[PDB]
Design a binder for these strands. Structure first.
Lengths: 66, 93, 221
RNA sequence: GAGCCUGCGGCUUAAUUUGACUCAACACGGGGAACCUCACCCGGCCCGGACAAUUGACAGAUUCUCGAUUCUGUGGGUGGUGGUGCAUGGCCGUUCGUAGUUGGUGGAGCGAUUUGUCUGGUUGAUUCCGAUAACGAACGAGACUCUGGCAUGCUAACUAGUUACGCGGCCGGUCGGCGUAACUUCUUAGAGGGACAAGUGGCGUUCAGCCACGCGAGACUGAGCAAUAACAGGUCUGUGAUGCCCUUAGAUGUCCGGGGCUGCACGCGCGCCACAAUGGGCGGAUCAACGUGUCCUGCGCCGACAGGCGCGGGUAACCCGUUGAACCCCGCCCGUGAUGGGGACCGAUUGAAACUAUUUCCCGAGAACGAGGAAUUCCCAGUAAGCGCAGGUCAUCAGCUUGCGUUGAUUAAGUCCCUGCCCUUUGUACACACCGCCCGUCGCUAC
């Protein structure tokens, strides 16, 4: 059950197109960016977003994502 | 089967304050607000029942209790029965 | 005294809050009763009443307001002058579930129409600002057989924790000469970031992000 | 299957105490039956009585007295455990928590409607990816909420504790009890962290992910809230929820000691060992946890046990209480045996009252049941089970149930095989919709 929902899929993509240099390949640094940038009333949801951004960053540096 | 002396104590107390509260229990010994007399609960719920059927008091209920309010018409009915002048006014009004 | 324990003190308080609530919903339901808030303070128990129209509850010189003050002081055991009742007028009643539940109930008891009264309140809920409402009437509607017609417009959240502070549900009974009808009113509260209109806490799925504020790249120092 | 405990048929006939009978009936109605209150049953005091005459009554299963706005002063005021849940609402169960619904714009069709809402992969999931005459969103799902696993980091504790050296016995060591110095490991609860498929390897439209390794308190789980709706599936006996009807003063509210705890065989679930041998016994010894407490119970007299008496704490992290729980651990006894296996059936306490044993204890008492027919229930991790505790019910009580801790596995990290289930295609004379619709003979009546 490691599949993200549209709340995590959409948020992780709109945070990259607005902030690409901010997020790197570390989940812990990306986790702190979402605290100051986005407003989320949940902590477990922030880790899912920042966790999926880390997965996207490995794909971005590998090539153009679809 | 209701005496007369208790009828003045239940109506004058209802006159000085237009609120009368009684608990719905046909087996209660003495009314809490009527402590100086031995008025049973039947003489409080049935003697007030005749006022509602004749349209002299308005009742409310919260699962066990009556909340009686002397209507403007009912106070006029008690002004002559209790033998009080038309100048005095209750506390609620 | 009796030395009331805390496990029995909170219960004795919650029952007084519940019994006073039911007594007023059976007595002040015509003036638009919406609830009461208590503040247990020694020698001064301020029991405020929330209604939509408070000018008629007062009277000529505060006649009906003196009765209720004299009503609970004799049923719950409050001393003379030890209890004080205040009446306040609420705003945007379209967000109050029990206010709109008793509103169309007093119009459905006449058999006029079940579709005009329901549509009549749907406009006021949307006009006052809301993210969706619900009106459900069940029973022997338009025939001896029980029929239920649900009136839905907008959005509605059913599951989760936000359903406690974002949607208020009200249930009322309808007394008709042919049978009994039910009334389900579910008003959704608008997200007010301040806290004056409605709830302050946003939805958990409100990830909405702020703009980068046109971050400019420097060329030369 | 064996005895028994309760539940419902069947019987019984004052009445066996009624509803609900597949999943979704049968420790259900929070219903474990002395009175209550009980709707059932039969006897009776009775206006503790009214919208437009005595209540009594030592005499008895009738003599007379007193009160002095309530007496058929002359067609309706009202009560509800009486019916109808195939008339209802509110709630709840079930479909089914299987994941499924809806809008705008655009496209197709004269139109009802359709597309979106999908071949495939993946995911518990309409969860994503991908595909695409659809695009973009909403409900559900998820997120969220309370729980638990760690944080020697922080905030604080005489209503929680340890730790440091001093008066208590032994051999200063070694163990206990009694007092206000430092701060918080242990305890409590506040804030904030931590875990996201993040790292490596492998397999993959190299997407969605999946698998194995590390590091690590976990690669992580148990609740709750739960959609479009539907059922004639329950609730009128949960209500000052209610319509109508029946019954409404020889009463379809009570109540008195109470009757209603009822058997020739079949049925469910559940406790209790058997077929001592891994068990019963006896004596050690030694460890819980939630929750409740105006009733919980602590000490001293004395019963063998069950009890009883005075003195006390606790409305509670303060007293019970360091909750000395059982199983278990250790020593002895028992032994090809219906045995020390099995516990069936034959003085105190609660209250006004136990007869048809309320429970409890003592002695006596010793049946069936040799791991159980065809079938059938439940479950894969602190789980099943074993063991015991507490709450709800409660004057008296737990073979029930909701919780709780305790000891702790077998097997499986799977499949449509079977039985239940949604989606797609397909067919229909069905559409209050297979509990559907419909044909002919026969039978009745009329033309």
């Amino acid at each position: 059950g490691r599949v993200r929902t549209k709340t995590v899929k959409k948020a992780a993509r709109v945070i990259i197109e607005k902030y690409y240099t901010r997020l790197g390949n570390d989940f812990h640094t990306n986790k702190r960016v979402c605290e100051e940038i986005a407003i989320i009333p949940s902590k477990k949801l922030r880790n899912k977003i920042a966790g999926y951004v880390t997965h996207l960053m490995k794909r971005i540096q590998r090539g153009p994502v679809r | 089967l209701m005496p007369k002396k208790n009828r003045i104590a239940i109506y004058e107390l209802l006159f000085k304050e237009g609120v009368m509260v009684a608990k719905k229990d046909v087996h209660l010994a003495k009314h809490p607000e009527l402590a100086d007399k031995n008025v049973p609960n039947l003489h409080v719920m049935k003697a007030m029942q005749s006022l509602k059927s004749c349209g002299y008091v308005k009742e409310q209920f919260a699962w066990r209790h009556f909340y009686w309010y002397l209507t403007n018409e009912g106070i006029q009915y008690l002004r002559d029965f209790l033998h009080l002048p038309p100048e005095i006014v209750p506390a609620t009004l | 005294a009796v030395q009331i324990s805390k496990k029995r003190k909170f219960v004795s308080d919650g029952i007084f809050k519940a019994e006073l609530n039911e007594f007023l919903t059976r007595e002040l339901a015509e003036d638009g009763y919406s609830g009461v808030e208590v503040r247990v303070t020694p020698t001064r128990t301020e029991i405020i009443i929330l209604a939509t129209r408070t000018q008629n509850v007062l009277g000529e010189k505060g006649r009906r307001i003196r009765e209720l003050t004299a009503v609970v002081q004799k049923r719950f055991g409050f001393p003379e002058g030890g209890v004080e009742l205040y009446a306040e007028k609420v705003a945007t009643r379209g967000l109050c579930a029990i206010a709109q539940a008793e509103s169309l109930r007093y119009k459905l008891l006449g058999g006029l129409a079940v579709r005009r009264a329901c549509y009549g309140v749907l406009r006021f809920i949307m006009e006052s600002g809301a993210k969706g409402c619900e009106v459900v009437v069940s029973g022997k509607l338009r025939g001896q057989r029980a029929k239920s017609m649900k009136f839905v417009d907008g959005l509605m959240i059913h599951s989760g924790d936000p359903v406690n502070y974002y949607v208020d549900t009200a249930v009322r009974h309808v007394l008709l000469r042919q049978g009994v009808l039910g009334i389900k009113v579910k008003i959704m509260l608008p997200w007010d970031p301040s806290g004056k209109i409605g709830p302050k806490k946003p939805l958990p799925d409100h990830v909405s992000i702020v703009e980068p504020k046109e971050e400019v790249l420097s060329t030369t120092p």
